[PDB]
Amino acid sequence: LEPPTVVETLRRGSKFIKWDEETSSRNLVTLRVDPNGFFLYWTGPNMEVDTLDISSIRDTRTGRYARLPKDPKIREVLGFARLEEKLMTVVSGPDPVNTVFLNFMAVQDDTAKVWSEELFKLAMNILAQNASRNTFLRKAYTKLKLQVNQDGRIPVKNILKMFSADKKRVETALESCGLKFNRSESIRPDEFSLEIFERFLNKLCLRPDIDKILLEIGAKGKPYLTLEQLMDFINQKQRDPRLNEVLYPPLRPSQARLLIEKYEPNQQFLERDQMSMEGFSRYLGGEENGILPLEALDLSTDMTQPLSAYFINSSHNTYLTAGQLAGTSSVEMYRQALLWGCRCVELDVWKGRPPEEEPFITHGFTMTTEVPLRDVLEAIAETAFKTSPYPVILSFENHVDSAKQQAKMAEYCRSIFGDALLIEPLDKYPLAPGVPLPSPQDLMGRILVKNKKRDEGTASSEVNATEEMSTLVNYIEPVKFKSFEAARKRNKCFEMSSFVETKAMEQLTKSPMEFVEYNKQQLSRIYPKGTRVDSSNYMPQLFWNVGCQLVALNFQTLDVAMQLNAGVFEYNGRSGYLLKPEFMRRPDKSFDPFTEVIVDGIVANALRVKVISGQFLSDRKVGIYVEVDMFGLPVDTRRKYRTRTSQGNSFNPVWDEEPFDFPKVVLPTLASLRIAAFEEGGKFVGHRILPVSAIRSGYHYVCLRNEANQPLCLPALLIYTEASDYIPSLMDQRARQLAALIG
Amino acid sequence: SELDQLRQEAEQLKNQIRDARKACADATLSQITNNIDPVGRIQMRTRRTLRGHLAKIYAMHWGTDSRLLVSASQDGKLIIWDSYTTNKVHAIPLRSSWVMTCAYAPSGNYVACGGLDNICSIYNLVRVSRELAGHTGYLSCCRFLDDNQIVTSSGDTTCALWDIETGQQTTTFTGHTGDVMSLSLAPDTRLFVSGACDASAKLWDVREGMCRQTFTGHESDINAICFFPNGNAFATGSDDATCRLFDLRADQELMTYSHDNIICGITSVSFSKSGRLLLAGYDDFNCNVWDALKADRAGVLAGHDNRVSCLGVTDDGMAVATGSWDSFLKIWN
Amino acid sequence: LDQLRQEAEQLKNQIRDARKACADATLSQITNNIDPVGRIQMRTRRTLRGHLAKIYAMHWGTDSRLLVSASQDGKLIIWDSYTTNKVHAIPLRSSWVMTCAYAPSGNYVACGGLDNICSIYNLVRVSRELAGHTGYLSCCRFLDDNQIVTSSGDTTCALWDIETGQQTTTFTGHTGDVMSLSLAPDTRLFVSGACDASAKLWDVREGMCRQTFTGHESDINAICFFPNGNAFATGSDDATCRLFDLRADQELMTYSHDNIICGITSVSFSKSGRLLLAGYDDFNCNVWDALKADRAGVLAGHDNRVSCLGVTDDGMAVATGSWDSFLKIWN
Amino acid sequence: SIAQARKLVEQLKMEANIDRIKVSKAAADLMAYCEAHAKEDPLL
Amino acid sequence: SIAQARKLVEQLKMEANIDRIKVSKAAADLMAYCEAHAKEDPLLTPVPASENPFR
Ligand SMILES: [Ca+2]
């Protein structure tokens, strides 16, 4: 892992042409990136500086992949062979559906490849998304400092618009630090420094919830804390007791001296090894006081287990942007799904027209829009291994019956993908009964094809396999499901099966202990039923308990089931491959997925979460509550929790109420906590998905992401977690347990 | 083998002192006064609520005219109030927000200040008149002797008397071991007391410039100390929830105003005009009137949300004003 | 390899101490006997309208009557500054123009921009087409009817021959984008500013850099000349005009002020040398006194960034042109 | 740190030779001060 | 990188051996020019409005 650095060609700047298609406008701007790697600023057409938040950039594409102009005036202006090698488009947006294109054509040769590559290296960083509270507070300062007006000054409408909750406290806290505070006035950017910003933040809101923390440790009458009073705060409250005390040792005083030297402004206490009350409030948002460690966010997993022993990100009918019945199929969602972390996309191929043989992709008999197969395979070959080099599984849904097009699409996938396709089995794993599947380490950067070899909607009435298209399918070969006692006797691990949700929920409740044993050798895949015409999402945590790898979900709609799916796959390097817990990939160690007691072999845990307070949660005076859900096994699922609604008393509300008690979690390495802050009235503000097997214990800052797992700038929460080890009619008995997990 | 003689000569004189103290120990104040009447139910009321600050309040001081009061906030903005008609007659901004003290002149013209920036910024009644530098620690408390003298109490284990016109340390008071936290002047304006952190208040004379009576007894800090109105006694509020009462002529401890159900430290003590009620403010958001002659509670003044950090009676006993860490200041009568 | 840098450092230290020993007085101190000018009020008289997009440069005719205004919409209008009559409307085959010039005689007009070539017209048709720049064109100035000097963004200047289209002398020696250049009134040796915060002084005969000048911290967007050919004022992007000397090799005065934070675009001296004019990004133009370093007036009539500013040859009028497709002639 | 023990016992020896007023008379002076001043307290 | 490393030490050497008259003399000439040519400078002095070409 590496911190975000900005090279000296992006800070000095370069000249570009910001052209546009709808407005047919054009300008010669100079793009710069501030040295923290936070924003992308350029002087607009009327000297007011525009910005683009660099944590919202989905993709930067250059060369032949960039968008070309579609208006002959702009083509005559720009110069329209190798002049399209100087194009660059940067896309951005909240969700995969609604993106906004920014088009930049360079005026100098070679300043587009570097300018696109060094923006995609900055927009896909881990330490810029899991940044601490201090970094997200220095980001809102740079957003105010860089957005100067026509004169070169930080305006005063901006500092009243950023902290737009109330208006008396903002103008009073501006007047109380020696600045200008009217409605139409301006502040010079050399008299508005970082310290004059934080001394305005401290006068903005009052913080008694840190006064209680300082009272609990003993800051009675002296205006400082000693060395031992901070070391025996860290090693007593901010230490998670689940770790082994030999390889994760507690704090020596020499490291607390380094912390005191880093976080404290006053020079009196800096030489007597003491820490003030501002040097502690700067410690609670430090880079070492994080809610999750930096080993639960990078690629640190045993990546050599077989391919049937991993949860895999997956999607179902990816091409749509709306409901299944009256939508509009697009090729851009194949880019915005495979860049977002997906690893299994569906192709609903169909038979071409007697004008000419070209296979197109649409939902059958539904009057949608039709996109062609070659452009979709171009998009999949473009954005495959740009985020994570782990193998995509192309799940074809074949419907062509003419033998000409079946040979056309067998050469499309061999000319577009090239060497990234898997046409022949490996040297170590032949296609025999009794061998395990190859690991994702051994299939690095390959593309696997899923098609037939020699209430479900249009997925049942398929078209039988030919000798030309079925030369590709070797390792992931779909068959028809007979029985688990029939699939167990075959002992062929290179097959799979694809259950619809209503047929998967009839062996989920019936016989799950054979189901877990079936998902230890072969794969599975669940797509939602065809009656969900509004593209709703079933819960993936229903079928992640029984072991199913390719749980496929609708990507265009962002409900709770999609927020959990997009938040649980952020960990492990955003690679889309999460390892199973050990009792769901061992051959002998079986367990019941519906058990109510702890299991011998799995260490249980216990979790207590208390919501202290949170800051900057809204842009109008309205109350805030917080839901603390929990997903996992159906005995660990408890979504009933909710705090009381505050009154909007300040910038930060404080909640004074009892903790939430999760006293027993049976399988901790599979469960995940969901802290979501709402307004009073059903409005959404932010959320975060935290794994329970790697969460920390103490007084921490939770930085709330938005509805599609992008980091919000200002809002956050402060919570107190205490995580410790545990100290000691069947189709209705198994269908009343899942009543919380279904919905 | 020469330092053992000096250490034994040190401790044997402590023994000679502690024998002379119990030579004078005859009775206690409760055993003497045990036929006197009680005081009763002292039920008070919030007269005014002086809103207007934006951060915590660390100190305050009453004017000698019993009408106006200064109240040093933590945003770096002193405000001089008019306690009868609530109007803010002054509002002085500073150069450093971390302010731990303030003062007021006996004349009514010079308001001092201080804080974490080692200096004491004497103002004029507005602009900076002086910047008294020379300390190497934070400035805990500072009091006015006259219009020409000021006496500070800083966190480098030293008190100091200053000169307001030249700006030099006239006499220096040294001999503590821990950080000096509070200070109060006697009514004859010729001797003060210095309650440092190491459970020990001392008695300094301002003219000879050296200590003459050193008390011990606590087990914690001393966050407040304030004189009886005869210049013969005081009360040292502490961190282990024990207000005491010492005597100057006897050099002994008389009472200990402890209690069950209270474990929170003191942040401000003060007597009344009569010397009957020992008003003391606690770090658990509540003030408790201690009857000084019987060591029992008599009235409850609990209206603040966060801790009460400063309290002060006036010089005719008509009012008592508390200021807490929640940016509000109430006057109780 | 490092010994070359050591002898270069000692050689420039012989420039440093000779600059220090030559700095014996200060023009901020010598001018204290001089009485100030105070208030100077200029007013808009002719508002030349007719463009469609943003104006990027302008240049005055030698008889102080006609002026050419190069706009972003591919147009070089040649106005009449007395009656406001559009004498020509020259359409160029490229949209992005950056510079335009005029002739000492009054019959040729050059242009140029992002197409890396300097189109020379005739007063209409392109007469010559001057190719040979590897980057884009920034500013061009005629010497006579047969010669031009151009400044490109590929870190060089060039001296062309119009009748043959051949680069005579190629001034290299910069390491940044040459944003502007200005010519001596006798046309013997010129100056050039870059994006290195370093002005240089070139000559048209030997093709060599005789003097170098430092001082800024950003790009240099404008250079003019003192009207006797002995000083120049490099207006930059950190809101600091300066004044230099061709003889002492030292900076003399600096024109800095708070409430002026925005970078500046185009400077110009006066006919005598007592005044100075600059154009700022805050849409204004502040007349500076060239000796006492105080403002003397504000030319505020524009609604966008003042992109070009030019003073006549008889010293009578100034003309400004901003990004709101308007020109204003002050008097 | 040799003269510090002399500087300590100097102030101890100055603390030793003072006057010893008895606690009963001191507390009686306290009660006589309070009973003569309990007429001008508006709180009581 | 090496031929340039000789070109720079040539360029500084040809710059260092020049005549450098004092800033007092330079500012004296620069100050003497302005009021000597300020009689014929129509920016400082106002314009006779009949002879003004723009009014
Ligand atoms: Ca389908």
Author numbering:
A (entry chain A): 13 to 92, 97 to 470, 576 to 849, 867 to 881
B (entry chain C): 2 to 126, 133 to 340
C (entry chain B): 4 to 126, 133 to 340
D (entry chain D): 8 to 51
E (entry chain G): 8 to 62
Report text from the authors:
We also determined the structure of the PLCβ3 · Gβγ complex using lipid nanodiscs. We reconstituted Gβγ into nanodiscs formed using the MSP2N2 scaffold protein (44) and 2DOPE:1POPC:1POPS lipids and incubated them with purified PLCβ3 prior to grid preparation. We also determined the structures using lipid nanodiscs; however, the lipid vesicles permitted structural analysis of the enzyme-G protein complex on lipid surfaces unperturbed by the scaffold proteins required to make nanodiscs.
Their activity is controlled by G protein–coupled receptors (GPCRs) through direct interaction with G proteins.
